[PDB]
Subunit: 496 residues, 4 copies
């Protein structure tokens, strides 16, 4: 609330903070108490178009795209340093806007600093290749250029974190960008734009559009001046975005959700597996792309595991993200909580058991917030909607498996392929399983870790492309083969 | 006609040569005389589905996907050697099916051998990376795996050449593939499948579907078991394919056409520029993705250039591709010639001049074939359909430019971005221009060269992704981050 | 042998030694002379180097396209496979090892040439995003130049391939000298390369151990890289000579390679692989597992099992199907191995089995030495620290993982080693702490063209095989173009 | 200077020489003693190496995350920028070059540390697709280990940064010894690194005579890499000493760098850059353009223009803004330069201008030597072939592109050179044929952290700067895991 008195309420287009063309606004809510905490501009499709045209003009001017990579790196580093400088206020703003614990928000800010620092350091480390040409008297080189004008659409769960994954490489490579954060969580994205403006970028290089205005998304994914659309969010919206991008054969990078398996063998460190099953299921109330919502446990220890998990779930502390004792905050919005609630009905109707949770808590200090109890669903199977579909809430399912081969078959039996884990003290076995899982990231005896040094993304319906790592940077580059004939001679194919 | 008596007429699905499920067939035509030369199976959508399921079963069996990269390379090399062994018959078959000169077909076969040889040698050279992890007591590695099941759709202009650009990296990386060549030019693709069978691949690893059956394309682009759709062809079909691929968030690699500029400065080697303008415009009767259909010539030499080009165009020798004196063969089909013809009407109506050509030739030996005269269109400008749209025939437009800046502006003023050239003895100038052109390939003082060592593909509406080179191989790989916690400890976030 | 060349190959011609001297080549199985070859002079070596320089400067190979160089290297690979049987037989005849081991070599050799053939045209350098506005910066990779290559007697053609393949793929000119006692397969491979066809002077073969031949090959001013595989003493001398012209050196010297067996290893696997590590090629392997380190809890069991198996090892003619271990290479080498037995006993170690020449009648004429196990020894002993390079292993116990690592690293060497344990996590921890170029987990011996091979510490400098191996034969050039040059005007006008 | 340390830095402590010996440091502008520092012993050097080894083995820096190591290297970069003024002044005081040149050095140094900071966490090694079924193959890149670093007097802190930055980024422990005559900025950077904070023994600074501690730094068994920048004679000695333990060497020695000026060069640009190439830092630059090669048709015009400009070069105190060229480094060095003038005249060359100490009163107390142009010389002469390393250039003519290339490559060196021509295609053709680590087209002198720097032939071994520079400080380990180990059963059961 302190920081909010100085935070911008506007969009940032072509070097200026500007309101919506029609003066529309949106009230931003704190999910802990459903109170309005801020009011921001709700931009129009014409605003989005203007931002894209500004990004294109800036790209063509070359002020950023032709800046030295070393200098671009120094600027990205300056953003990183600002994130660290404002770590406390940023973490508080993120907890206020998204509801997650302040400790989780601090962790995000540490990661965000590291993301910008990594890409700053990567900016000037390539440039392309020299090719030994198969044609005598020619020089062949591949030059890597910025892809161009990029549109970036981020989700509500980790707004600034996901923004950093897109902004850092775009700026390091010399692109121009237009970003639109989730309409319900724009606060830390507005703040990072203020911080980037303090660092200084050429007019139009960076643009922030706010809202969920009519056709705003369609303009960001379907405009002819866009070279890459990068979207993180729901599968249905991602598919729509990809179909729109097709209208101009535009590159797409998508990170959609997952149905992430947490595979626990009977020779896992049992108390570790229980601890990490809770962590996988319930960090940020399960509102994580890579949440471990699908637990697969070996039959021999399944009963022991379920009882241990359930007993721990009953003790999870719900409350205000600002209170140090809180272990799990509320879910993000009324609409999202309703969707979670509707999945409980689906689960029961198809024959699954709600072993614990599965409703809103009654406690007085939680009544005004968007809370939902941490939930464990048992007696289910792979045919069920509750197992196959991403609920994106504080909910896990538990299925048993007999053998290593069955664990792999079940884990791969989904439309998704983002991340997962294998818990076993037999590292050779864990490695065998990891090699067979169709997942972008596999953890052995861990759950959740990601970092700027390694690419992240999904097989199958979890996405297209990668974020983070050298591969993440590559989404923002395009290759050009320049072939010079150093002794050109007439071909004389056509008669003289 | 000799080779045709032993050539298969069937599809190749799951290790067997099989007819269409409905026994339908298609007559294949020789464009030189419009005679039926062969009759092949015309497959159904159910055939395509069966091939895809076979490819998936084969992929999951691991017989090819878990074969050593070195051994996969040896097999791809064996295909390369077969291409060379059968060079003469393959070249003849390609000229028979597509109409281009036998000399052009020989060049194709030399290129095809080199494409398979390049990928054979690349197969075992990069399995991923070790990452220095930012988390203590963890090991981080990125493993590159085959992307999975791939569908491959090739065009009629260079059937076997374009097939090799797709097959070679798919097999080198360990993917399973389903290929469908253009319905009007299947002959050399059938033959290469016979040759691959001789080398030996596990059942289902390679599949050939033939036809343009109802919903065949839709199944190949929209099936849930496909991990990558790779399509080379027309922009309208490519967009449709991408939209269908979106239904399962499937990776797409597209190479659509271009409106490829041939930029000739007043300080070019003039006779070289004239020679290469002819080559750019009229190889394969202009039916080249990268044909130099859009000549941009400096105003100072434009009159001289037009006269020199026109005088040469009048001498181009049309005829049978099998006759050694032929310099340009027919176009591919009645439908395609009609499309080219309709553009002549469009050009005149919008105010351009048909300086030479622009009709079917009258000569008696050309009357039965699908010939169209090499054509030069003058007095045109960037606003015109004839300049903006890909005609894909033996037709060039000529526009003038005043300055280097105007040449760049005009060259980039199209929806495409595949390839182009800059002719100037001032290499520094040519490099400045090359750096500003939004094209996947730029030639300086040359026109047409491509090779397996360097990536090929388009900016903007010319495509998504790359073929050839290391980047071409990468389309057929997927990255997996395996993170092992080597000293796992309880996090104890959730109370005990 | 009736058709094999007896000469050196210099500047496109098979030629005798300048002084007509020859050397008799021996089969270690029966000590019979099997062939007679030219014994070259230092002047022959100088002529070869000058021919290699002239060929390099002509550009006929160095400026050939990388793709075409790869095709030629592939053609050599194919000739190896075509002549696999005869090459394997020549290698067994010359070196004494089993025909099965020689076949394995020829498969590896084919694969080495095939790997480098495929690599030849895959990386010409990089484009650098220059920090100076209006400049273009690129790094071009060129062949390093003229290279001299000196190979050992244990795996003559194998070690030759590791050097020849990258040199030819990158466009270098080379002068090779195989071990004076084992030239046969190297002569043959030169015949095969000549059939493929290379410009005159690109490849040259010097034969012998003539006075100063080695010195010329390591110290000549026209050499850009000296690549030597052999003994530590000779390697050091070669490096010192190379210094006279600041010449790049690549060295692979021996090792004291540890074979670490934990009490939770697959016991019969560990015994099997301890035998393999110790006795393949009668232990005449740079990476032989001569130093067994076994956990104390299973040490007695392990020693008894190992010793009982060693007593059954079948010695004989490498051509006989039942032979498991052939003879050692020469009288001098066997004498050196014999002298180490004396050293071992004098410093207090026990010769548990073996430690002498076998008595059997069919082995009496050959250079055989019994597979030997030395027990009750420790890290202070010469028998543990020094590379014996014979069919001899030592056995030391360790208590903990930390002690195994300490002992394993307690040598001047750093080539290769193994860790046997069913606990893969533990094996990985140990592997990370061993100062060794190659570490095997639950295996012993494997190497391949796809991965670099070489030593930490006194085991060498540089790497062979893999992309790193290729890089020894390249040099980087930074070409920086100022595209808008302006006067600096630092100095007064 | 009143607050600058006078001591060595060994194992986390500032310490005097074991024998309390000291050395007086001189300012070449006036030959006045400016500071007195410890003159260490060979035992001090040994103690530093052993401390570096202990620190390496503790893993406090070598097992720190690459990301964290990068942050520390970045912190050093920031300290350099913070203390830019004082560092530049100290460098000018110690070495004599202009303050403006010293500022340029400090900006470069900041960028060198920043580059390597950003590179620290960007590799780690490779995953290999193994040719053996049921095996996992990976190459892990580890710090090479303990490194000794010996730097020259011409650009003390610049050359120190090229060595320190990659060593620290990769996780090595280092022992550095700056030139005995120019230790000031190196002492200062160690004070700054100490403020950033590194584990005890990770960084060590030895001060004094190459003749006392040099052999220990190049010949100690605990060293894994010796990195030396300096004279050819010393570099060779160092390499021979390193051979005693088969130790990796990286050497950057001088050059005889050609400045090739075609008749179609931008003439006034070529004159400007010829002066810059010849006379920055009084020609005391490893890559100084001492060998001018000019096309015959413009040679007379060029010589007249160059000579006329050389007469106007302003000599003086590096702290005075009008100074364009400072003094040479020492009495011994100036004497060596003077002796070359005698050599040049005796072999028939012409001293067209300069060739002696200046007479002006304000220059008499300093180690000044006039900028010199030597004409009428040829490639057979010592004055053309040998590196004088002073404010001296030779001028030779050439007729054709082929002759320019032949002459340019006709030296024992191969560090750097330039080609001036408006015909870029021609310049590129020439650049491709010059045996030089760096070739500038229409420029002279530029280097940067993003691109590797080093010499062909006798100019060195290895590279500094760029990704290749980082690689000198890494070692490859192939870890091969057999994931389904089976008995081989070679030996009888
Ligand atoms: Na909110
Ligand atoms: Na996908
Ligand atoms: Na046809
Ligand atoms: Na596109
Ligand atoms: Na022999
Ligand atoms: Na070494
Ligand atoms: Na001094
Ligand atoms: Na050298």
């Amino acid at each position: 609330m302190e920081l909010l008195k100085h935070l911008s309420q506007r969009q940032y287009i072509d070097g200026e903070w500007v309101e919506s063309a029609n003066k529309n606004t949106r009230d931003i809510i704190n999910p802990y108490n459903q109170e309005v905490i801020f009011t921001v501009s709700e931009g129009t499709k014409e605003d989005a178009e203007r931002a894209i045209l500004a990004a294109r003009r800036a790209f063509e001017s070359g002020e950023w795209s032709q800046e030295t990579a070393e200098t671009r790196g120094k600027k990205v580093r300056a953003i990183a340093d600002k994130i660290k400088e404002h770590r406390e206020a940023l973490a508080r703003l993120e907890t206020l806007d998204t509801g997650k614990t302040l400790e989780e928000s601090y962790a995000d800010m540490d990661d965000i600093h590291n993301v910008f620092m990594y890409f700053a350091g990567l900016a000037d480390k390539d440039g392309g290749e020299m090719i030994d040409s198969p044609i005598p008297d020619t020089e062949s080189k591949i030059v890597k250029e910025p892809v161009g004008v990029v549109t970036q659409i981020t989700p509500w769960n980790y707004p600034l974190l996901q923004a950093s994954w897109k902004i850092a490489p775009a700026l390091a490579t010399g692109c121009s960008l237009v970003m639109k954060p989730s309409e319900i969580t724009p606060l830390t994205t507005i703040r990072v734009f203020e911080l980037m403006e303090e660092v200084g970028f050429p007019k139009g290089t960076i643009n922030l559009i706010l809202g969920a205005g009519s056709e705003v998304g369609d303009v960001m994914s379907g405009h002819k001046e866009v070279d890459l659309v990068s979207f993180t969010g729901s599968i249905e919206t991602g598919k729509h975005i990809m179909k729109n991008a097709a209208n101009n054969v535009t590159n797409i990078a998508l990170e959609l959700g997952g149905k992430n398996p947490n595979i626990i063998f009977d020779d896992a460190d049992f108390e570790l597996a229980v601890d990490q099953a809770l962590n996988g299921g319930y960090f940020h109330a399960g509102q994580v792309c890579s949440a471990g919502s699908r637990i697969l446990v070996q039959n021999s220890i399944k009963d022991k595991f379920e009882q241990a998990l359930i007993d721990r779930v009953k003790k999870i502390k719900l409350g205000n993200g600002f209170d140090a004792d809180t272990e799990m905050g509320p879910v993000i919005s009324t609409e999202h909580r309703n969707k979670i609630e509707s999945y409980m009905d689906v689960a029961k109707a198809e024959g699954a058991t709600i072993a614990v949770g599965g409703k809103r808590p009654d406690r007085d200090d939680l009544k005004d917030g968007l809370f939902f109890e941490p939930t464990v669903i048992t007696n289910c199977d792979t045919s069920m909607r509750i197992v196959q579909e991403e609920v994106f809430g504080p909910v896990v399912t538990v299925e048993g498996f007999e053998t290593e081969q069955e664990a792999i078959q079940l884990a791969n039996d989904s439309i998704y392929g983002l991340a997962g884990a294998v818990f076993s003290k037999d590292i050779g076995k864990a490695q065998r399983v990891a090699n067979k899982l169709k997942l972008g990231t596999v953890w052995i005896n861990d759950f959740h870790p990601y970092f700027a040094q390694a690419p992240w993304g999904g097989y199958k319906q979890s996405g297209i492309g990668r974020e983070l790592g050298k591969e993440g940077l590559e989404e923002y580059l395009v290759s050009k083969h320049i072939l010079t004939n150093t002794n050109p001679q007439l071909v004389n194919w056509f008669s003289k």
